[PDB]
Design brief:
Three copies of one chain form a homotrimer. Chain A is mainly α. Chain A is built from 19 helices and six strands. It is classed as membrane protein.
């Protein structure tokens, strides 16, 4: 079984056949085989043509994540937070945490499925934790200075430190048993229960149709369209199709407007469209193709129920006033929106992974540097967007809550599933070199620096904190890159 | 002669006898031993519980240093500074320097008594210097931004750099003679004389009884007691006994009040209590028990003289007006207060040292770290408290004056005493590894960074300076810890 | 051929003869042989007194660069910028860039003349780039906070990154051909053309005699002279001769005054003095003595033409009103002033080089530490002075424009001249150790940190950016020094 990279040294005539019968280059989770397109479709003598196009494609992806987070994800999450009268810390700890941590948990599971890649998975988790706790927090503090909550910050950082030290001990022992995974799950459940109980205790003390449908689906404001410059007009033309598709798919609820963005026919159609998208997209449509008893597919029952509910709500409410349950739509407008993030992020990885092969690079770098960046690009986008809109407290609290979520839930679930499926009494962790311990030391240093600096700063997070964190991360990345290339021997 | 740690692998029945028979399991400073209590006094099984108790004890110690510095040390020192019309720089250079540097000098002497531990002593001095010049200054600048005096800062940093480079040369030569120690003493005397002369030259240019006694000893304000929360009430109850004892022992003079905290009967009793405490505590009752000619003990003459003076001042002054020499009491209220710091700090070390055995570590690096932290914990407390109260200039100047004091006086006195006692022509310094030179390079880097940054900042010390110093110290500590564990081979 | 340093171990009687017949450790550029003066002139038994004198001399040099930049260079450059209505970015990109980069280009040429020193030359270029991009920018931001232009900053940093990566690739290949040098020259020409075109496009969118001569040459204001303190008076007395000489030599044009500093007789004499100085200075007289086919010397024609022009302008204008071409004088008042910088900087190097020969100074590294500092001392002085006067944008833009200038033009011209003179098809670059790659990684890290930080800061360059850069540079210098002395083995 020759390596996949050997297709580069193999004759151009047989490269496509080698790919068709070569494994170790068929990552999934995406939708398009990029290596296949490079090596079989586009003219063999235009290698670069596909390349530059892909680069452009990559840039287009960074536009999509720029829009979905700016217009639909953050406003829906803010409406959810306002409707339930939740504090910023609680919302950041639970909702943004789940939305930013689901892909990381899925990647951790798919990596823990193979005992060989357990070290790669734990290293990727540590790298993502380092990146989020340093660079995301730094940008959050720099973009919008603010004052953080003292008690929730101390509580969250203490819980995160406990979780990190438990993971450190588990890695040092080189093995994880059933008891460890059960303890991780119990610790996360206890953290959530403590959040809810403390928040509750603190809360007690203070005491025609068609034209409106076409207009709602029009993303172009002609009055605004007329006054833009040439570059702005071109950017708007580029953004138009994806914006129209997202408007068609993702509902939005904004409490800042008197009408609360109520578009009765559009919302009724979305009540059918969004669940269908969810079932047809989750797990790449495995549940969509699933048949209930071999007679009725899941998607058919889904569309039937959606159409029934849409007809009921169409005949139940009027155009003038939005129903009292309108905020529930925001929940849907959240969930689907989060999905529109995740898939996009996956595609970004499918870019970085592939082009990489063109220039064979070390996994001691591909799996630890680029994989964590691809996993946390959605978190970075969402946190920066929320910081710009005017909610720094929530994003800053999520910056630790989400990472606690990934570490605890991902490690525990992966270990439990590996134990149950393989019927093994333990899962063995193989430490691949000293780079894992370097990552661990960097994470510990970042956590200690934050815990020492923020209370000493009287909880007024200025820009110097973020700038110093940025310097630290850049220096750490440079040190790691120098170590991998053999310049520094440890 | 087996190592003391071997008591851990030895049978539980003979552990107490093993501790008793070996004098090396003994530490001089503490009023109370700890390893003996862990082994013999406690039930062998309840080993964790006792440990937790000690942890609690440690926390209680951090409370004591929190009170003595906040209520008695800093106000007395401020009254002393105001009475003599001294500038902030002068007071920080002399008085706070002596008060924060006496334990470091004592430790340096007790370490230089043994030629083997000379390298450990010089490394501890360098580590304490690094910690004070970086972390203490960083916290001082972060807690309260201010504008520092340019000329005294430049003078102090130049003198400190000269002293550090002289120590560097002495260490490189690997030997210290009588001439070197005499030069160190002469340099410190010249520094003090220059301070006095320059300060003098500048200003010339600019041109019933019982009820009051019981009330003075009551630390509880009932009106204030009623309005505190449950946690605050519990904290006050915990602080009450030590506060009462300190009020009984340490006089305080506050010029901010009209009466200047004049409690005539309490002060008269303190005039006898404080000297008795000084003689009975200094050198662990060493001078404490000595007898004058074998007939009259020192403490008896002390109490006789104190009672005579107390009777004289009782019959000499009235309750209405405080005597013109009242500020002299502040001097006493300073000295005893400083002692109340030092002993406490020692106890903290007796915690860190001990528990260490149970989970021993690398004394080579640890001696350098935990020992310096224990020595400088009092300096850190005093400087942070003074910065909070509103005197950043004085603490910032002390941050260099005190370290000049420790380096010069400790090294010179240790070398002189070792030469005189052992009748040797020189004292040999053995460089233990490259970690000493790493410490030296870190100290030099910190000094160069300060000397380049502060003048370039127009002497307006902001928070970024301290935050950057904190990052530097954390990174340096992480690098040292990684080097000691064999991850990085030099 | 024994090394020059061997003169130190050789007998004092033959040291001067050895120097007279010693070809190594020598260099030409200044107007003095410092080693000859140390080892032959001053009494052989007074090694130190003379050394101290040189130290004083060095300090005097730092005074000269302090005056010429403060009084004549920056005001003339500001007048040039104001007269042509140039933006700050354009002026910093072209004029200050040439003035600060001419000596670096000359040193790069004189180093590329020898194929052995190509690695030393490229390392010196990288070190100067690192120092300017970090420390100079840090001081510029700290001394005067400001808001930078976004688009020119992004453009300049992108061009600099492209140039640095091209140099990285050329060094990795270990060879430079004619095509590479021609591409470097074409890239610099394209950069200049893009600057001019973009700048042009933007603005289109917005749409008796004797007494006055003696008074002009008097640098002492008696009214101001009377009120200074003793130290200030001594400093003024020390500065008087060089100030008088510079007033005699360098014309100055200040648009802030109504008369625009018009001194008709002094300017007429300067019209002859300045060109004569230029011809009989640059190239240390190299073109200085060449003859016109023996028909006449160049200096004679120069003084004849200067006297003719001076007579014409003397008979052409009056004392009351300055001519419309007066701003052209500023151009001259710029160029000669820049020369008064360059020579001084060279002398500084002739200090550092020499005293160093006395010591066992290194070169592998030192040739890159002290040489870059000596080359960029003029740039640092000019940028700090311009930042103090109130033009931070121009100096900050020059901080990248000038370095682009040195890298591109110096490398291209050196390679082209070496190829043409030696008739070789390529120039071979020998990488001397890993320190060159360490320098490259440091430069890349600094550039990445700037490109990530400045846009994230909303282009409001505060003091924390500069302070963090200063910390980074100090740490990097300490790491390099530790690596060279064998403490850290790579």
């Amino acid at each position: 079984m020759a390596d996949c990279r050997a297709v580069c040294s193999l004759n151009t005539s047989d490269r496509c056949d080698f790919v068709k019968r070569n494994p170790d280059c068929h990552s999934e989770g995406g939708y398009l085989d990029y290596l296949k397109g490079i090596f079989c479709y586009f003219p063999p003598n235009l290698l670069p043509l596909a390349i530059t196009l892909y680069v452009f494609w990559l840039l287009y992806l960074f536009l999509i994540l720029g829009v979905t987070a700016a217009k639909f994800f953050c406003p829906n999450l803010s409406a959810i937070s306002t409707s339930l009268k939740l504090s910023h810390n609680v919302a950041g700890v639970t909702f943004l945490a789940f939305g930013n941590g689901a892909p990381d948990i899925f990647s951790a599971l798919v990596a823990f499925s193979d005992p060989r890649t357990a070290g790669l998975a734990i290293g990727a988790l540590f790298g993502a934790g380092v990146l989020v706790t340093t660079v995301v927090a730094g940008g959050i503090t720099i973009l919008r200075p603010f004052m953080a909550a003292s008690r929730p910050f101390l509580r969250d950082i203490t819980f995160y430190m406990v979780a990190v030290f438990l993971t450190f001990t588990a890695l040092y022992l080189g093995r994880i048993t059933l008891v460890w995974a059960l303890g991780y799950l119990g610790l996360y459940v206890f953290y959530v229960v403590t959040v809810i109980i403390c928040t509750w205790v603190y809360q007690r003390q203070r005491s025609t149709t068609g034209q409106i449908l076409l207009q709602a689906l029009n993303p172009l404001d002609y009055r605004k369209w007329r006054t833009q410059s040439i570059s702005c007009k071109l950017l708007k033309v580029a953004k138009l199709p994806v914006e129209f598709l997202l408007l068609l798919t993702v509902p939005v609820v904004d409490p800042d407007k008197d009408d609360r963005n109520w578009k009765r026919p559009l919302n009724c159609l979305q009540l059918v469209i969004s669940p269908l998208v969810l079932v047809l997209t989750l797990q790449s449509g495995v549940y969509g193709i699933y048949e209930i008893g071999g007679l009725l597919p899941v998607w058919a029952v889904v569309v039937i129920v959606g159409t029934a509910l849409a007809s009921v709500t169409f005949f139940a409410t009027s155009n003038s006033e939005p129903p009292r349950l309108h905020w529930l739509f925001a929940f849907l407008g959240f969930l689907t929106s989060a999905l529109w993030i995740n898939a996009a992020a996956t595609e970004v990885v499918n870019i970085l992974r592939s082009l990489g092969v063109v220039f064979r690079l070390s996994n001691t770098v591909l799996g630890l540097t680029l994989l964590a960046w691809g996993n946390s690009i959605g978190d970075a986008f969402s946190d920066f967007t929320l910081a710009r809109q005017g909610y720094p407290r929530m994003a800053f609290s999520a910056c630790f809550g989400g990472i606690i979520f990934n570490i605890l839930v991902g490690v525990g679930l992966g270990c439990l599933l590996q134990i149950v499926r393989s019927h093994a009494s333990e899962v063995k962790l193989e430490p691949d070199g000293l780079l894992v311990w370097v990552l661990a030391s960097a994470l510990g240093l970042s956590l200690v620096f934050s815990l020492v600096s923020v209370p000493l700063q009287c909880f007024q997070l200025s820009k110097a904190y973020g700038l110093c964190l940025l310097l630290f991360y850049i220096c750490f990345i440079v040190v790691v890159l120098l170590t991998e290339f053999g310049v520094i021997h440890l």
